[PDB]
Amino acid sequence: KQEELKRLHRAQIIQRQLQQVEERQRRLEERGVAVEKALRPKLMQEWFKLVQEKNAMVRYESELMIFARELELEDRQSRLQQELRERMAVEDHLKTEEELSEEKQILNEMLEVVEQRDSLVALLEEQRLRERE
Amino acid sequence: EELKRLHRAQIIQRQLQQVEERQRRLEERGVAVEKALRGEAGMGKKDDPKLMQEWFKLVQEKNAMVRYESELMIFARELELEDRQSRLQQELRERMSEEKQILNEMLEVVEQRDSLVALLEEQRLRERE
């Protein structure tokens, strides 16, 4: 329960930031429309700045996507781990051939959740080492 | 792959080295600017508002580097844990006794990684605000 609360809070923080990003992109969309309507000097210069600012927001949105997926995966993993801890309260000799292979299937699900998670951390690592430009 | 992971580790060790050096250069500019602020480098310098301005830019640039150093720390630990995890998983996916203990070591490694991701998230979502 204390594990699951620190997670809900991180999810809200992320939502709140995606909402702020959406809105900042909405303002840039409108300035962008006005600048392009004005293309019937300083005006061409504004168009390039808007492109930069939209780019920045997209990079920020991307990071939030990654964090939000990683968070979904922590949740799935935690639940699979619960399903597995429950099954391991019973000694192994007291289980069927079938019961034992469901334990092995749960464990595979959990390992491929972990693999996806590590793949998203590697991508985020790449992005943070690339943003030092 | 163990060599993907190796390569990512070398990248990180090398970026920490570039960071340590960028901080060394900033230490030196910082020392010169402060010698100039105490009127020791040129009798005009101390009156120039560009000089006070440099001091504040150095502080910002030092702060940026420390944020970067922090991120590299986290990534490097995470990477060690990814390595440990993948090896414990390999040990386990070979065996299928100490089988139940290996699984527990791996679940603790997974929990520590969750925890470093959460810390990284907190810091990245505080560099904005």
Side-chain angles (χ1 to χ4, degrees), chain A residues 7-41 43-44 47-84 87-96 100-103 105-114 116-127 129-130, chain B residues 1 3-9 11-12 14-19 21 23 25-26 28-44 46-56 58-59 61-92 94-97 99 102-104 106-128:
Chain A
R7 232 138 66 220
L8 181 70
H9 191 223
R10 294 169 45 198
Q12 285 178 339
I13 284 173
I14 290 162
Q15 268 184 80
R16 165 193 182 104
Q17 294 201 353
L18 285 165
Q19 279 167 21
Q20 293 163 323
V21 161
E22 185 39 41
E23 194 46 24
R24 175 51 80 106
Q25 288 172 150
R26 233 191 38 69
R27 273 55 169 99
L28 296 172
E29 281 156 17
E30 285 163 358
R31 288 170 48 187
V33 156
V35 162
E36 285 180 354
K37 268 170 178 181
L39 298 173
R40 302 278 178 192
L43 201 66
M44 181 83 159
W47 199 91
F48 280 91
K49 187 211 188 173
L50 289 196
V51 164
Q52 273 308 142
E53 293 168 302
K54 282 185 188 190
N55 226 273
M57 291 304 101
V58 168
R59 295 226 306 282
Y60 191 13
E61 180 176 2
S62 283
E63 194 177 11
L64 297 165
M65 295 302 203
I66 286 156
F67 281 123
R69 183 74 164 123
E70 185 285 317
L71 205 61
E72 279 164 19
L73 298 167
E74 275 188 39
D75 177 69
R76 195 171 287 271
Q77 181 268 153
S78 152
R79 289 164 190 279
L80 288 166
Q81 189 180 326
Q82 274 302 122
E83 192 175 351
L84 193 69
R87 320 276 297 215
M88 292 181 322
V90 164
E91 290 180 295
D92 274 358
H93 65 279
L94 310 180
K95 307 174 172 150
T96 59
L100 274 170
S101 88
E102 255 306 296
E103 263 167 69
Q105 150 81 187
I106 283 155
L107 189 48
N108 298 339
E109 268 175 63
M110 193 187 326
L111 296 179
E112 88 189 36
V113 162
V114 163
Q116 285 180 40
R117 204 273 285 272
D118 303 340
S119 159
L120 295 172
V121 176
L123 176 49
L124 177 59
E125 182 191 294
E126 194 189 351
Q127 270 181 26
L129 293 178
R130 188 200 319 166
Chain B
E1 179 73 64
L3 300 175
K4 274 182 193 164
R5 250 187 268 114
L6 213 70
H7 195 40
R8 308 220 321 278
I11 286 173
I12 289 162
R14 192 152 264 151
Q15 291 281 117
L16 284 167
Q17 298 277 11
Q18 288 167 264
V19 161
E21 251 293 287
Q23 289 174 310
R25 272 187 299 150
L26 296 173
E28 286 164 2
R29 288 168 177 284
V31 157
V33 161
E34 284 177 359
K35 214 156 274 182
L37 285 175
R38 307 187 299 280
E40 301 186 15
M43 289 165 159
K46 194 175 191 146
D47 278 353
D48 197 353
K50 251 135 215 200
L51 200 59
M52 272 288 273
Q53 281 171 34
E54 175 71 353
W55 197 90
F56 286 95
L58 295 190
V59 164
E61 294 168 67
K62 285 184 188 190
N63 279 353
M65 292 303 101
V66 169
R67 288 161 174 185
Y68 192 17
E69 182 171 2
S70 286
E71 263 181 75
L72 297 165
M73 300 291 280
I74 286 156
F75 286 121
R77 182 77 163 121
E78 166 276 315
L79 200 44
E80 206 54 34
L81 297 167
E82 202 183 289
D83 171 71
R84 196 185 324 287
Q85 181 181 284
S86 74
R87 289 169 192 282
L88 286 168
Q89 188 172 322
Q90 187 36 36
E91 180 79 354
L92 195 64
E94 291 168 341
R95 299 189 173 208
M96 85 193 192
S97 190
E99 253 167 291
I102 282 156
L103 185 55
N104 286 8
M106 227 189 113
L107 295 178
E108 295 245 23
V109 163
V110 164
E111 200 206 75
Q112 287 180 43
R113 289 176 86 273
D114 294 341
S115 161
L116 295 173
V117 175
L119 175 51
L120 179 57
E121 185 181 297
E122 191 188 291
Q123 198 201 108
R124 295 291 302 118
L125 311 188
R126 189 178 299 168
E127 304 208 4
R128 316 297 179 161

